[PDB]
């Protein structure tokens, strides 16, 4: 059929087809059938341009994360550009109608949709001395030209990251009670759960984005002690802060 079933057996063939895959996520076979029937004419119009399939959002709801979709909100629709490793999620707050999916797919084909940037949600509160960065607040926080921003790119599974974390919190606390508390940010970002503009080759990576020098961040290479990190901030930031 034109709209097949995306699952562990058919995934490799969709990934080998060399064209995007549009996913129709729904939690029941009836809804999958309803949406497949509804959207068939769009799949037909796109034959050989974009493959369409349904995907069992009960069994494979987690797969929605691969498309920068929320893993808990169905039904859902997204296009994966397999060539380019780009993901184009349709807004899970909108109803999946013929007209809206047609307009979405038409916009995708027209080049009108920017690839989605993977991000955790904006943290609901920013209290505790270390600031949590996600892709959606990276520009506002890290590239804030009025603050020296120390940013740790880490993975939750990373042993050195785990070892660093208590020292990193001690560092945040020192700055938070310093006379530089409104111009130094001690921040971290889970680089496994957020796309960042930085090229990160290993974890942890620590960079200082100085006030007034955001295009020239300084990569830290010291001993990862609190004292060494204070020195690093003091030496490389605009505010010579400690």
């Amino acid at each position: 059929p034109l709209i097949g079933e995306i699952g562990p057996e058919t995934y490799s063939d969709y990934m080998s087809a060399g064209i995007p895959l549009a996913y129709i996520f729904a939690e029941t076979a009836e809804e999958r059938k309803e949406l497949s029937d509804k959207l068939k004419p769009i799949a037909e119009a796109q034959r050989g341009v974009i493959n369409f399939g349904t995907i069992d959002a009960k069994a494979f709801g987690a797969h929605a994360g691969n498309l920068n979709l929320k893993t808990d909100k169905f039904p859902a629709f997204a296009i994966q550009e397999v060539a380019k490793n780009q993901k184009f999620p349709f807004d899970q707050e909108k109803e999946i109608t013929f007209e809206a999916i047609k307009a979405f797919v038409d916009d995708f084909v027209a080049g009108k949709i920017e690839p989605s940037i993977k991000s955790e949600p904006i943290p609901e509160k920013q209290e505790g001395p270390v600031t949590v960065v996600v892709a959606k607040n990276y520009n506002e926080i890290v590239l804030d030209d009025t603050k020296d921003v120390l940013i740790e790119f880490y993975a939750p599974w990373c042993g050195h990251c785990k070892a660093l974390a208590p020292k990193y919190e001690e560092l945040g606390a020192l700055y938070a009670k310093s006379e530089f508390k409104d111009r130094v940010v001690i921040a971290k970002v889970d680089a496994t759960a957020n796309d960042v503009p930085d090229e990160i080759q290993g974890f942890p990576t620590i960079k200082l984005y100085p006030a007034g020098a955001k295009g020239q961040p300084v990569t830290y290479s010291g001993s990862r002690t609190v004292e060494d990190l204070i020195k690093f901030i003091a030496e490389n930031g605009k505010y010579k802060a400690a």
């Binding site: 699952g7 995934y11 490799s12 494979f60 987690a62 994360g65």
Partner: peptide
């Protein structure tokens, strides 16, 4: 393939 969490993968 699928992971235990239900993520699909190739190969």
């Amino acid at each position: 393939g699928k992971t235990k969490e239900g993520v699909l993968y190739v190969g």
